[PDB]
Design a protein around this ligand. Structure first.
Ligand SMILES: Cc1cn([C@H]2C[C@H](OP(=O)(O)O)[C@@H](COP(=O)(O)O)O2)c(=O)[nH]c1=O
Ligand SMILES: [Ca+2]
Length: 129
């Protein structure tokens, strides 16, 4: 997999963000995770967390997996990085997302995120409290 540049346009919620990719505005849906909706428990904390992460980054990168790069809503499907730190993994490690939506071919970082979920659950963090 390879990291590609992108620039923040706008935080959206815990697992979507608006980024400019190859000069085009795009909504990105974070691979392999599921945050609560803003209106659900830990929803606002997940949105806040992703928002701070992406707004504070001096460098945003997106990394597509081997399978589909857009979903049925035309959202990009990527692993997204804030100054070298994966947002997808960070959310899971903090217990603000579950590993989810694991589809064959777009699952390179599955066991990295499952490892993070196991540690968040061990710590009873947030969703696992
Ligand atoms: C993460 C991800 C979501 N999706 C689609 C599946 C779900 O379909 P449905 O909308 O029919 O439930 C939806 C969940 O995204 P949200 O969690 O953003 O709602 O997005 C993909 O198709 N591929 C993916 O990799
Ligand atoms: Ca969600």
């Amino acid at each position: 997999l390879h990291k590609e540049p992108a620039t923040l346009i706008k935080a959206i919620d815990g697992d979507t963000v608006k980024l400019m990719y190859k000069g085009q505005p795009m909504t990105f849906r974070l691979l392999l995770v599921d945050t609560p909706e803003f209106n659900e428990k830990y929803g606002p904390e997940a949105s806040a967390f992703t928002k701070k992460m992406v707004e504070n980054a001096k460098k945003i990168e997106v990394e597509f997996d081997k399978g589909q790069r857009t979903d049925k809503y035309g959202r990009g499907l990527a692993y997204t990085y804030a100054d070298g730190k994966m947002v997808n993994e960070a959310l899971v490690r903090q217990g603000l997302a579950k590993v989810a939506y694991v589809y064959k071919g777009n699952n390179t970082h599955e066991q990295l995120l499952r490892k993070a979920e196991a540690q968040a659950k061990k710590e009873k963090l947030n969703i696992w409290s």
